[PDB]
Structure formats: structure tokens, C-alpha cells
Design a protein around this ligand. Sequence first.
Ligand SMILES: COC1=C(OC)C(=O)C(C/C=C(\C)CC/C=C(/C)CC/C=C(\C)CC/C=C(\C)CC/C=C(\C)CC/C=C(\C)CC/C=C(\C)CC/C=C(\C)CC/C=C(\C)CCC=C(C)C)=C(C)C1=O
Ligand SMILES: CCCCCCCCCCCCCCCCCC(=O)OC[C@H](COP(=O)([O-])OCC[N+](C)(C)C)OC(=O)CCCCCCCCCCCCCCCCC
Ligand SMILES: CCCCCCCCCCCCCCCCC[C@@H](O)O[C@H](CO[C@H](O)CCCCCCCCCCCCCCC)COP(=O)(O)OCC[N+](C)(C)C
Ligand SMILES: CCCCCCCC/C=C/CCCCCCCC(=O)OC[C@H](COP(=O)(O)OCCN)OC(=O)CCCCCCC/C=C/CCCCCCCC
Ligand SMILES: CCCCCCCCCCCCCCCCCC(=O)OC[C@H](COP(=O)(O)OCCN)OC(=O)CCCCCCCCCCCCCCCCC
Ligand SMILES: CN(C)C(=N)NC(=N)N
Ligand code: SF4
Ligand code: SF4
Ligand code: SF4
Lengths: 176, 215, 96, 318, 70, 156, 170, 115
Amino acid sequence: TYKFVNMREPSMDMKSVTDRAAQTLLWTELVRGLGMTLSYLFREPATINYPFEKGPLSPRFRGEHALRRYPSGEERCIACKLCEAVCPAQAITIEAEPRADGSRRTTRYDIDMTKCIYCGFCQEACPVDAIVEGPNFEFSTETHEELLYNKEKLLNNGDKWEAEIAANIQADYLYR
Amino acid sequence: HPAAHGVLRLVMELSGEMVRKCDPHIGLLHRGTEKLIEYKTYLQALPYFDRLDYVSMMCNEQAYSLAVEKLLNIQPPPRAQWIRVLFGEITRLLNHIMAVTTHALDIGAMTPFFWMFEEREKMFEFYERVSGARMHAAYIRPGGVHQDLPLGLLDDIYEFSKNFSFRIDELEEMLTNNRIWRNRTVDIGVVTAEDALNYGFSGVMLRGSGIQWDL
Amino acid sequence: ELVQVLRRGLQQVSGHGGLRGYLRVLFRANDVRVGTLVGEDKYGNKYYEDNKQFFGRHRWVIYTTEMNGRDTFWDVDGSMVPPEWHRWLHCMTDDP
Amino acid sequence: MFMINILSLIIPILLAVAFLTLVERKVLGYMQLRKGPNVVGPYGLLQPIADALKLFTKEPLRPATSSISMFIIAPILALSLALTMWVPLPMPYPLINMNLGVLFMLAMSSLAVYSILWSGWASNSKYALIGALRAVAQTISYEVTLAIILLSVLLMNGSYTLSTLITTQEHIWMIFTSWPLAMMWFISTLAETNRAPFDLTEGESELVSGFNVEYAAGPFAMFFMAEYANIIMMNAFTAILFLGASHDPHTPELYTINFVLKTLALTITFLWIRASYPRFRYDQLMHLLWKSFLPLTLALCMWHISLPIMTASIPPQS
Amino acid sequence: MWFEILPGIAVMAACLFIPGMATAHIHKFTNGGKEKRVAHFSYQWNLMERDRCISGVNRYHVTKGLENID
Amino acid sequence: SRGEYVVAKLDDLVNWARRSSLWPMTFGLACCAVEMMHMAAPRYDMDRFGVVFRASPRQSDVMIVAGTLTNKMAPALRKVYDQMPEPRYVVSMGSCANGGGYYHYSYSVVRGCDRIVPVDIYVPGCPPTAEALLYGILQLQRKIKREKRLRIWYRR
Amino acid sequence: FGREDRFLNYFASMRWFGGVPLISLGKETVKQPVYIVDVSKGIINAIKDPDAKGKTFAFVGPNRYLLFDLVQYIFAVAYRPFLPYPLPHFAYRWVGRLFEVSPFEPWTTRDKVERVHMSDMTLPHLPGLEDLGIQATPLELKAIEVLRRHRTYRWLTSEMEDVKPAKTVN
Amino acid sequence: MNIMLTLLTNVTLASLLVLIAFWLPQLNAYSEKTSPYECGFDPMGSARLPFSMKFFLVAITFLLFDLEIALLLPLPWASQTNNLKTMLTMALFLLILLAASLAYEWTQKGLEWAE
Ligand SMILES: COC1=C(OC)C(=O)C(C/C=C(\C)CC/C=C(/C)CC/C=C(\C)CC/C=C(\C)CC/C=C(\C)CC/C=C(\C)CC/C=C(\C)CC/C=C(\C)CC/C=C(\C)CCC=C(C)C)=C(C)C1=O
Ligand SMILES: CCCCCCCCCCCCCCCCCC(=O)OC[C@H](COP(=O)([O-])OCC[N+](C)(C)C)OC(=O)CCCCCCCCCCCCCCCCC
Ligand SMILES: CCCCCCCCCCCCCCCCC[C@@H](O)O[C@H](CO[C@H](O)CCCCCCCCCCCCCCC)COP(=O)(O)OCC[N+](C)(C)C
Ligand SMILES: CCCCCCCC/C=C/CCCCCCCC(=O)OC[C@H](COP(=O)(O)OCCN)OC(=O)CCCCCCC/C=C/CCCCCCCC
Ligand SMILES: CCCCCCCCCCCCCCCCCC(=O)OC[C@H](COP(=O)(O)OCCN)OC(=O)CCCCCCCCCCCCCCCCC
Ligand SMILES: CN(C)C(=N)NC(=N)N
Ligand code: SF4
Ligand code: SF4
Ligand code: SF4
């Protein structure tokens, strides 16, 4: 079905003609627009008091990255390179070798945050929940090099945000 | 230029202020998306479609997903289909708000821009609740949708839809019957139905010219 | 009544600990609202909630004047909150 | 003491211009559901000071293709005439009492036209030239209509003295007497001051900042000051001409308070209109005045010539 | 809220009060506490010049009367 | 010293004006520009902080490079940056402006606007949220607050 | 000499002070300026040459000019009216002393005046750009880069070949 | 005298503002900074080329109507005369001729901009 947005004709009776002439000479619809803006003036503003107030977020929010640990302190990442394989932008560089104790662990884990598109495929592809996208989004730097995270930086982010990251994963892990 | 949307170079010949010819120079935002898609896989190419029409993002994702599922010979489940349609309509609301408000801003009116962009902010919150990304969700994928809705999303969407017709009415109070808006827009850019069909216009262009067509 | 609004303003003036406290909260926070004290972290930041305000403005933080070793009397960042209060303020949970 | 009076007329006008900038920001914000500047100072009161210091400590440049002489003269002329228009206004006592105080303001406005023309032509850029020509057309239309409207309204008064305007409006208001001319005069002052919906010389949507596209730092600030001073001066002229205030010779402060309140009301109406309406096209503006206002203006001029004669209500010459 | 606009309008009004009040005070100060004489015509100007001459101090606002004629 | 005190106070006054009056150029390239609009929107009103868009480069202090910079567009970006009078600052917003972004290995994309213009602040994200961009603007303001031009000149 | 130099800009900025003051009318001064890109390339090649470890080089241009002819050519390329006049050395020294009271960067100083008046030495024994592998760029090829900024709108678009090269002294 | 002093004060203040603006801040000018503005690209032509004026006739009509308003301005003093009927007839005659000029131009399409 369909409807005509503009196919109405005005009546030509004297009362309607006089009303249209009054609208032409006396700017009725212009005063109407003025009244609408005055109403909005007296309404309550919709501005938050940043940075003392923050907009709502969800447990699914994708922000700054982090590498997690097991509750015993061991790193979760096992150098499986699934995140490196699935990364759309090829932002992850991983190099690994057997550790001293024989574990499969990474020696290099780089994420170029200027190449990352913050899509969250890496945390979907991780089989051990090692790499996650934390809730942090205020991590702007003053130089380009500071956005080239390495394994030490990501582990520090994980250790710093572990409580909030664990809470978000607990909240949203039943939908995954 | 404020009216050139950032990446349009319009080389114009003017006799006085009358426009003698327009020569749109595009490609200032050509990135090579198709070549890169050729180099990616089918799941890795989804955000590329997310970033094509960055005002109808879930619509782009839905188009790509429909194409891939047609090639794969699979069918998304009914709940996934209903979520796709719901978020496609939410995306249509976002896009039409952007279009109307930016058009009115290029004309000279800005209060509707601010109001309807507050509404856009609320819809962005819906996007972020389902997907974690405020605009480039990458939520609709070949085979259905990535994740299920959280347990309050439908109620909040109902509240938003309940309180939105009033926003559209306030938008219309400033533009629909305003004689300045009518003078600026009436009999500007008239295109005939045959011209639209031959030139390849689709959607609102055809419908405004009067062709009864909708996919 | 305008008298009620003026009395609420006077209570807000007296609610921050005198005129000096009102001036301090006005100059370094641009807000003079009064809310219930949800809690305070180890760094000195205070967190308040007011459910009567519309969503987004129902929770706020007054930052400390000195964090770690930097004087933050006027230079207040959005990253000065610990992760738990960060989650609470950004409303990923309703539990402080 | 006359230099002291000149300073007392100049400096408060500039201060009011800066705080009109702030007020317009905040009013537009609250009509657009925002807060406007409230961070720089208490309720954002230091925002104009910050803007002025930033502008006058920023580097100003002369374009390579510009005519430097007329590039510099234009902001000087604009600000000088903006400050000069205030000298015959009675609040309730004019600084300079002129027998023909209205024609002086008309002539100075017509001269204030040329600042934007010369700045646009001197800049030697296509956007500046387009803005200058838009100014030419706008001044054509509003100038003829303004002349006739002022003629009729002052014909209801008897002379061209603003103090005589106060005396005329002792009892009732010229708005009550002649509201149609008041509406057309308000529209004409919008066009004259280049405010929305007639902000065509500096139309950001079509032209990138219009005639002052090449102006930066201090010379840009002078154009902004001149425009806002013109806004306030035209609103004050409208308030004196149509909304007459009671004058007490022994306590003149009451007239000053009433005049200031009415001027602020009209300026806020200007900001309100800017927030509420779209922008005209300049051909549509030219066709608006000539094809709508000019016929009514001529008819009302005939009516206001005849009305004192047929009602035996001719005002005294002095 | 909308009353956060009032301080700016208050400052603008305070600035606009200064010119008129200053002009009135200066007119009364330089004219012996009385209004500045309005001379729009040659008759009024001649009256002012006569007042200057008869004052004996070269100031038109120094008014003389019956005590001066006799 | 008296001269040191005077120059410290003067350049605190000058830095305050520049910090509190920021005028970004009306210049957005891609999807990152929509988040600039949402920062201008009522929710995160940038006009509160003295941040006001100006169309002309002659009247702008900050260039927010928000979007993909292509080879066909880099000359225009450099031209408008040069036409901005000093002091001027650059905020690269989003992955495309920061590095390459999704289009790093592309024949038609400049790998970072810092190859073209000197960038002062880098805001990560695709796109950065409006709060993230606002944090970047505040960080730029705090960076301006540390500038000591008169203090350097006095000891020069 | 280059876009940001003192030399060509110093001679081309004397438009503002009426005429061009020259000591002995600049007929007793011989100068051979060198190009900035040539100097930088020579510095780079000095690093990469292992046989320049403990040496001394003399970077000079290919042509030597009198000061009068050099300034006349500068004003010809800038398309400004050239009005030279002789100024005695003591008067120029006092003028330079006047300009060096500025707390900011002075426009000219007494030492700058002396260096401008002094002729460039000839050091044929020391190596140079040709020895470091760089062919010196003549002033007539790169002067218009520096001096196009000083022209007016009437003469901005004038080409490089419109001005006959200055008279050299070789 | 007073008006001359006022004009001198205004012009001197504006000139002082310009002088402060052009001398207080640090200057750093080069060819790219001072080039003309055309949205980031070099202009094809020149800004001094002829710019067609589609309302050339309305400008001349504006000249004539400016004369008409100059004639009409002394009306407030002419209304104090004893020949009120002659004054009224002449004022209405001038206004009717102005209206006739406008009507003739409007019907002959002199107010339509050139295409
Ligand atoms: C690139 O894609 C895009 C984006 O990105 C991706 C976007 O985001 C958006 C979203 C943006 C918008 C919707 C709006 C943006 C567009 C605009 C055109 C901006 C709109 C803003 C407004 C309409 C309102 C904002 C206000 C503005 C613009 C005005 C600017 C302010 C100034 C110029 C102020 C400067 C002037 C001043 C300060 C006055 C001068 C100072 C004085 C007169 C003070 C002097 C006083 C004295 C000298 C007196 C001193 C003496 C005293 C006190 C006493 C001394 C006495 C003695 C006796 C000594 C869009 C649309 C977009 O398309
Ligand atoms: C033409 C106008 C004349 C009347 C002026 C009325 C008062 C004007 C008030 C407004 C002033 C505006 C500037 C404010 C201050 C900031 C700028 C500043 O410091 O500029 C100073 C300028 C600064 O030079 P600058 O060009 O480097 O300016 C850059 C300034 N900063 C770094 C702050 C951006 O000083 C000079 O130009 C001169 C410095 C000393 C050198 C003296 C040279 C000799 C000629 C002058 C001295 C007298 C000679 C007498 C004998 C002559 C015969 C031999
Ligand atoms: C316009 C006409 C020309 C006027 C010429 C100048 C006249 C005086 C101008 C008025 C000066 C106002 C200074 C305002 C002080 C800043 C207010 C205070 O908030 O700043 C603090 C201190 O500011 C700086 O430390 C110094 C500011 C200036 C201090 C005084 C400088 C010298 C003023 C006196 C000399 C003026 C006359 C000499 C020149 C003519 C730091 O706070 P800030 O981080 O930012 O705020 C962030 C916002 N938060 C808090 C919500 C996050
Ligand atoms: C002093 C304070 C006054 C304040 C007034 C504020 C009013 C509200 C302000 C908001 C308006 C500002 C933005 C609007 C600008 C544009 C408005 C506008 O378009 O008006 C023009 C309008 C629109 O024309 P079109 O629609 O294009 O039709 C043309 C057909 N060919 O037309 C007009 O001319 C209206 C102008 C008002 C005419 C006056 C009414 C005439 C009534 C006459 C009756 C009285 C006769 C007197 C004789 C009495 C006999 C006893
Ligand atoms: C009670 C008695 C009075 C007490 C107060 C007295 C002073 C009041 C203010 C007078 C005006 C300023 C006076 C000069 C201040 C010092 C300026 C200076 O010398 O700056 C030099 C320096 C240039 O940099 P430089 O180190 O030379 O490096 C070369 C470039 N590579 O650095 C710079 O150039 C920095 C760039 C800005 C310089 C100009 C701004 C200086 C501060 C001005 C504040 C007032 C502004 C008023 C504006 C007009 C009114 C609105
Ligand atoms: C950059 N984009 C997408 C815009 N719509 N831009 C704009 N200035 N309206
Ligand atoms: S969020 Fe996406 S683009 Fe970023 S590192 Fe993970 S997989 Fe790569
Ligand atoms: S997907 Fe997880 S376990 Fe595998 S390499 Fe990446 S972070 Fe390590
Ligand atoms: S960084 Fe992401 S959101 Fe920003 S322009 Fe690039 S693709 Fe768009």
C-alpha cells in the first residue's frame, strides 16, 4: 500500500481564504516556530557534566585491550594465534617459543592500536579468554609510538583492569 | 566546505551565481575497499561493509549477509530475522534523522539538528548495548546475528518508540509549513520519472518523482 | 513557588559546608548539586548518586585534589577513577 | 568632561558586545537543549574575555593577493561607524544632540555598508567577492524600504529629533499607533544588520565564512565587534522609536532602566529568531521587499501622510 | 537551567546602564546641577549667549535674578 | 626574580585564553566525523568548554583530522593546515587518521596524517566515542597549559 | 640562501626603510652565496665519506657577485623599485647599534653590517662541494623560490626567466 | 567640534586595535600560509575576472527610487504649511508616480533576474 505525502487542495470558501490571507499577512506559522523554540528554552537541558559524569556503557563495550591471567597468576594466552589469524586489520603480531618450564607461551605479542578497528573478533576467537577488550576508552596519547602496545603494556592493562574485566565477562558470558 | 560533506570537490562554472555546470570530483575518500575485501575472508570483510555507508551500518551488514547466505544456501532462524528487521528499521530512523537534520542545517536551521541528534544518541545506546560498538556494530553476520539481546533491550526500545512521534512532530513544527522552508525547497531539483529511471535513481528519489516502487 | 526554589538553592549553598565549600565545588566542578554519598575510594575521590535526576546525571564524582604525586586541584582527568568505580560510574552495574 | 563622556559611551558598548556574544551562545544552547559556555568562568562569564585575548594574541595574516590598504581600512571603518552610531541616542540625554538625528543614522549606516564591500574586494578571493555582491543586493533592498518606513514613522512624530520621539511617546506607544510599519521595520533591521534569516554576506553553509574568509586574529574580531554593536544599536533605535518610555526630568535613571530592558528584549528576540528560522536566498530576499514590503510601505506612507491632516493631529514642528 | 543565562544578561544590562547615567551625571555636573540647555534654534542660542554675558562669570548656567537687577 | 614572576604570570594569562577558547575547523572526512557531531550534540556539549566550530581555516586553532586521509586528499589537508594561522594544533582522531586503520595496506590511503601534518594529540578508536574525543580535547587543553613561551624567551 | 634564510630576506626586506643603504655603494664587496640544499647534501655526504674524517671544507656557490649587482638582482627578481644610496661606514654602524636594542630578534646589528660589507674569502686549497660530490646550484635557478614571496599581486605570476642573470665576477 | 572629536576618538581607537593586532603576536608567514583560500585547492582562475550581475536593472531602479525617497524626506516640515491641500496633493502625486513606476517595472518583468 501507499499514501500521498502532498496531494491535498485547499478549500476556496471565504472563511478559509481569509484565514490563509491572515496567515500570509500575520506570520502565524512563524510565531508557531518561535513558540516551539521558547518551549525548548524552558525545558531541561540534556547535557551531562563530563568528566564528573559519564555516559552509560554495557558489559559488551569494546575499549582498550588487555591480556588476562588465571587466578593463580599464569597467563591465559597459549600462543595459538587464532586472534592473529582472525584480525581483520592484521593489527596483532605474535611470536612464541617453548618456555623454560616447557609451556607454550608467547615471547612477542604486539597490537598496533592505530591499525586496530576495535571490532572484537580477537576476544571471540580466543579459546581461553586471554585477550579481551576492556572497558577503558580514555587512553589517548601525545605520540604515535605510545599507541603501539606490546606484551608488557597489555599485561599491565590486564592487571590494572582485571576486576572490572572479570565483572564484565561474568555479566555477559552467558550470551556468548 | 561545510556543505560539501568533507570529501567532495564540486568544480562549478558560474555565470554570476547561476550554476552553468557541475562537475563532481569524487574519489577523495576512495580507499580500495573492494581490493581489500578480495584479500580478506568472508567474516573479515564484514566491517568493510560496516564502514561503507556509515549512517546505515546494520543495513549494509544485512545486505552483505543476505548475499553471502544466498551463495551458501542457508537460512537464518526466525528470531535472527526479526532482530535483523527491527535493527534495520532502527537504522533507517538513524539515517533519516541524519539526512533531514543535515539538509536543514545546510539550509540554515540547527535546532532540529540538535534535538534529533539527542534521539540519535539514544539509538546509539541501543546499538552499544547489543553490540558493544556505538555505530560500527558488526552485529549482523551471515547466518543470523552475533549475540542475543540483553534482558531489558526490548523494554527500552519500546520506551524510545513510545516517546519518538512527539520528536518527529516537533521537527515538523519547524519545517513543514514554514514559508521559508517551502521557498527554499519547493520546485528545486525537479526530476521526472523517466529521467530518474534512466539515470538510475532508487528509493526516495523515485518515490518523490512518483514511481510506486519499494524493494 | 519561586520561594521554594530559592530555599532549595540556599540549602545547596549550605549543603557543601558553607559558602567556601559552595565556591570550591562551583569553580572546580561547575556543579552545585547535592547527592547522597555512595562511598569514597582510597585516592580521595567522592561518589554521589541522585535517582531523581534523569538518566546519565544520576551518578557523579568529585575528584580529589592530589592523586599519587600530581596536584589535581584543577587538572582533573576522566581516568583518575579506579576500575571498580569506573564500572559503577559508567553504569555497567547497579551495585557500588 | 566631554572626553570622559565619550569614554563612558565607548567602553560599556564594547563590554556589552562581548557579553552579547556570551548571551547569544547561552540562549542558542538552551533553545537547542544544551547549556552553552559554563566552564570558563562562573556561569561562563569569562568566555568573552578568553575569546578576545585569544583573538588578539593570534597571528593575523595578509593574503598574498590582497590589496593591503583596503584590507586594513575596512575593519577600521566598520568598528568606527559601529561606535559612532551611538552618539545621538537619547538615554534619556544624547551625547550629541542633533536637530536631524535620524538622517545622521541613515547616512552612517549606508556608509557602514562599504566596510564589508571593501573587505571582500580587497581580500581577492572568490568567496569574498560573492559575499560582497550579496551585500550589495541586500543593501539595495533594505535601504529603500528602511528609508520609506522611517519617513512615515517620523511623520507621525513631527521632526527628526529622538528627544522629540520621547516626547511623542510620553503617553502611548508608536507600536500601538503603527504596528504594521513596526513589523516591516523589524524585518528591515534584521536585513540591515545581516542577521538570520538574512545572514547572506557571511553565510557559512554556502560560502566558507563569506566576506571575511581571509580575515584572521584581530581584524576578524573587529568585524565581529562591529556587527554586534550594530545589532545592539538597531535594537536600541527600535526601542526608542516604537516602545516609548516615561521620562522623569528629575530622576532620569528610570528612563535608562526602561530603555535598557526594552533593548535587551529586542536583542533576545533577534537571537530567538536566529535559533528558530532557516536562511533566505538573496534573490528571494530582494523579491520579498520589492514585491511585498514596498507596495505596503508606499500605501502606509500615503496613509500616514493623510491621517494627521484628516484628523487635525499634525505634530508641532519643534 | 534557563536561569543560568541571567548573569550574562545582567552583566549586559549593567554595561548598558553606564552610558546613559554617565551622560546625565556629566550634563548635570557641567551645568550647575541643572539640565544641559537645548539650543536647537538661533533664538535659543541667543538666549544662552545672553545668559553668559549677564552672568558676569562667562557661564550661561549661572542664573541671575531680582537680587541682580536690584 | 621580578621579571621571571611577570613573565610567568603573563604566559599563564596567554595560555589560559588559548586553552579556554578552542575553535576547531569545520573539517571531517569519514565516519569519525559523526562522533564529532555527537560531541557537538546536547549530550556532550563541546560549546560548554569554549570549543566552537569555524568554517574558515583562517579562524581556527585546532584541526581535528577525523577520517581516512587518501592520496587524492592529502594536498588539500596540507593546504588548509598551512592556511591556519599560528598557534595551531592537530588532533588526529580514529585509527584511519592515527595510523592506517582498516585501510593501512591500501594503494590509495596515507598511512597516518602525521606523515603530512605535525600531530599534537592521537585519539584511538574506530570511531572514538564522543567521551573519548572530549577527553582528547581536554588533554590538548592541559598540554597547552604547560606551554611556556614567554618563560623560554626571558631565559633566551 | 634559502626560503627561511637571512641573506636574501635581509636584502629584500629593506623596502620598508625607503632606499637601500650600501657602503661604498656595494662596489667593493664580492660575495658567492651557497644554496641551503647544497650545504645540507654536503653535510650528509661528509658523514657517508670515510675519507673526510679530519678535514676542512669550504662550501661556496658557483658564481661570485658584487654586492651592488647582487642586491640589484634581488630587487629585480622581487620586482621592487631599487633605490640604492651610499651610506658612510660610521653612519651604518650607528644605525646598526640603533636596531640592536630590541629585546627580540634584531632586524640588523653592527656585526651583521660588518659581515655584509666584508667580501667572501677565496680558499682554493680547501675542498668543496665538487669534492663531496655535489654540483653547486646557481643563484639564478633558486632565487625565485625565496623572492616570490616578496612580490606584489601585480608580479606574483611572473616567470623565472623574465629577469636577466646578474653580472658575475669570475 | 564635539562630533569631530568623537569621530577622531573612534577612528583612533580602531587604528590602535589594528596596530596592536598586527604587532603584538608572533608572526611567521610563508608562501603557503598567505595563498588564497579555495577549500584546499588552488583556484583555477582569478578573483578579478568579471562577475556577472544578474540584477543589473534592479540596481538602476534602486538609484531612481533613492531619488524618490530623497524627495519624500522633507515631508515632516512640509506638513506645517498653510496650503495643506496643495501639500497633500503633491505628496500623494509623488507617491502615486512611485507606485506607477514599480507597477510598470513589475508587469514588464524588470524585477526578474537574468537567467
Ligand atoms: C565538518 O563536519 C561537521 C562537524 O564535524 C564533523 C560537526 O561537528 C558539525 C556540528 C556543528 C554544528 C551543528 C554547529 C557548528 C557550525 C557553526 C557555524 C558554529 C555555530 C555556533 C553558534 C551559532 C554560536 C556559537 C558562537 C559563535 C560562533 C560566536 C563566536 C564568538 C566570538 C567570535 C567572540 C569574539 C569577540 C569578542 C570576544 C568581542 C571582543 C572583546 C571585547 C569587545 C572586550 C573589550 C573590552 C574592553 C576593551 C573594555 C576594558 C576596560 C574596562 C573593563 C574598564 C577600563 C576603564 C578605565 C577608566 C581604564 C557539523 C554541522 C558539520 O558539518
Ligand atoms: C605609527 C603609530 C605611531 C603612534 C603609536 C601610538 C601608540 C601605539 C600603541 C599600540 C602598540 C602596539 C604594539 C604593542 C606591543 C607589542 C609589540 C611590540 O613590542 O612591538 C615593538 C616592536 C617589536 O619588534 P618586532 O617586529 O620583532 O615585533 C615582534 C614582537 N613580538 C616578539 C612580541 C611578537 O619593536 C620594534 O619594532 C622596535 C624595537 C627596537 C628597535 C628600534 C629601531 C629604531 C626605530 C624605533 C626607535 C626610535 C628611533 C628614533 C631615532 C630615529 C632616527 C635615527
Ligand atoms: C577583554 C579585554 C582585555 C582584557 C585583558 C586582560 C584582563 C584580565 C583578564 C582576566 C584574567 C582571567 C584569569 C582567569 C583565571 C583562570 C580561572 C581558573 O579556573 O584557572 C585556574 C588557574 O589558571 C591558570 O593557572 C592561570 C590563569 C590566569 C591567572 C592570572 C594571570 C594574570 C592575570 C592578571 C593580569 C591581567 C592584566 C595584565 C594583562 C593586561 C586553573 O583552572 P583550569 O584548569 O584552567 O579549569 C579547568 C576546568 N575544570 C576545572 C572544570 C576542569
Ligand atoms: C517593534 C517590534 C515588532 C516585532 C515583530 C516581530 C514579529 C515576529 C518576528 C519573527 C519574524 C522574523 C522572520 C520572518 C522574516 C520573513 C517574514 C515574511 O516573510 O513576511 C513577509 C510576508 C510573506 O509574504 P509571502 O508569503 O512571500 O507572499 C508573497 C506572495 N507573492 O508578507 C508580508 O508582507 C507580511 C508583512 C506584514 C504586513 C502588515 C500587515 C498588513 C495589514 C494591514 C491592515 C492595517 C491597514 C491600516 C489601515 C487602517 C484603516 C482603518
Ligand atoms: C601594571 C602595569 C602593567 C603590567 C603589565 C604589563 C604588560 C601587559 C601586556 C603588554 C603586552 C605584551 C608585552 C610583551 C610580552 C612579551 C612578548 C615577547 O617578547 O614574546 C617573545 C616570544 C617570541 O618567541 P621567541 O622566543 O622570540 O622565539 C622566536 C620564534 N622561534 O614569545 C611570543 O611572542 C609569544 C607569543 C605571544 C606574544 C604576545 C602576547 C604577550 C602577552 C600579552 C597579554 C595582553 C594581550 C592584550 C591584547 C589586546 C587587548 C585585548
Ligand atoms: C562527514 N559526513 C558524513 C558528514 N555528513 N559531514 C558533514 N559536514 N555534514
Ligand atoms: S578488535 Fe578486531 S581489529 Fe582490533 S585487534 Fe581485535 S581482531 Fe584486530
Ligand atoms: S586467540 Fe587467545 S590464546 Fe590464541 S594467541 Fe590470541 S590471545 Fe593467545
Ligand atoms: S577509524 Fe574507523 S570510524 Fe574512523 S574513519 Fe576510519 S573506519 Fe571510520
